[PDB]
Design a protein around this ligand. Sequence first.
Ligand SMILES: CN1C=CC(CCc2cccc3ccccc23)C=C1
Ligand code: NA
Ligand code: NA
Length: 575
Amino acid sequence: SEESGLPKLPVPPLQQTLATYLQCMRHLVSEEQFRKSQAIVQQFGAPGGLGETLQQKLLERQEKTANWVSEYWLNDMYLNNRLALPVNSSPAVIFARQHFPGTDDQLRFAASLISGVLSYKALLDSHSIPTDCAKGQPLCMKQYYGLFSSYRLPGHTQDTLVAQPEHVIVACCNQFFVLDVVINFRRLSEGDLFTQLRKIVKMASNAAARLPPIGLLTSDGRSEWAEARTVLVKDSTNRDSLDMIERCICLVCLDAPGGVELSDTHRALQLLHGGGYSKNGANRWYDKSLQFVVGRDGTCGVVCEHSPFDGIVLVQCTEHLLKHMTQLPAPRRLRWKCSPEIQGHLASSAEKLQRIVKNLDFIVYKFDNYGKTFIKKQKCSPDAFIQVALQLAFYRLHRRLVPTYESASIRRFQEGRVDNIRSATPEALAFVRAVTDHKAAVPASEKLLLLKDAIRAQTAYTVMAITGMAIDNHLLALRELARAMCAALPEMFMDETYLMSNRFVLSTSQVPTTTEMFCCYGPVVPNGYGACYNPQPETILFCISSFHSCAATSSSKFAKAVEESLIDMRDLCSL
Ligand SMILES: CN1C=CC(CCc2cccc3ccccc23)C=C1
Ligand code: NA
Ligand code: NA
């Protein structure tokens, strides 16, 4: 009735989590460090010890909350992160290339897309989204209600995720306009929206009314933007304008032509960071959860602030919008009252964003030799096969495995977001060593046994994670319950093995789509990669990111290593 009928997130047994943790990490640390971690974990998990006390506190939390990890996970994964949102945090979804002969063709697309957003939001708010089922077991639908009603406020040390006549904000030439999408309570038609967008484009070209590019401030580090926003709110005009953005449905960004070839890689860059201030980088407001981009040259997609929802729900929404597209007072410019103080903040923010633009090493690589159909003919799940290929790619290029992240949905449970699948398994290590160590001369028949055992272990970890039995959320909650007892964390969580374990040098996810769109994001540590893939029946799309500052990583070398690994795995499956 009022209460969810879904199960609550399970609390795994303490000794199960501690044993999985040590087994996860043994091959990723030195023998001496492992020996010390074994003793730390034994003391933490001893009968009558601290771990048992924290586990009892966690079972009490599970009883008193809908979801015992929600608050800790939201803060740990998103709100505590100080990095600027572009590239480091906010993923982008790139739509098919569009062809816009005239400005009017760009605006008709934007009007059609806005109409689709209004229609989808009406379905959402009437609770008419058919409940998703696993692969079926019903799934939590609460992420859908965060697509349009969320705003991420910056804080000095921790951000705040806020839930809220309806309006969109249109960004054009770094200027922001309120576009009301109802008049006389009747939703604006696609034709009315077109008429309004034309007025906006005319107003935005006016030099005598041009305001400073305040959106650039949202692209900065979170504490930097917290400081600049605090300067802004000293003025009531700015407060009014910030309130309008905080309460909009979404942004629609009418970007300027990019001036570069519209390859998939280049369209993805424009969606990730707008190409910086000199291009479209200030035509943005990164705190708002959805920024649809409809560029004059046909580059279209959506930039996502992903603190309120994960990738499956986002793609369900965007696929619905795109498929739906197949079937009067003037807008109000938001005013700003700036100072030389704010001008200094703008210059700083432009410089910092340019460092992100220049630092990103990004490639879209389409593997075209095979995809899901071939993989399923090997009695393998496509996801597990591709995760083992990524381990082999990393090992053959960098000669070690590293802590690897892969999102696993826990939407089977109330308020469920994700837990981590740790794909750098002991079985993956045995396989990649056998493949790469030519001196060992392991027979191909044995390499194939090791391959299938690595895929089996990957599949098992995935089942463990999606059923709430993996370890990362459990350890996070024990850690934060310990911090509530005493600000000095116990040795368990100060141990260098634990800190290492959560620096995801390879950060991955599978985002399958049914249309030509694709998803991408940056790495999460300076010496890391981001790898987001889209498996299709006969192809697999890989979006690979890394940072040019890190001499070890290279996105083009990693994409080549992925190709070589998929070909090696094909050859082993063809003996
Ligand atoms: C480093 N990283 C970053 C993200 C994920 C998974 C979540 C996600 C992936 C791709 C698109 C998304 C669009 C909207 C919301 C979440 C999205 C995994 C690793
Ligand atoms: Na996790
Ligand atoms: Na690099």
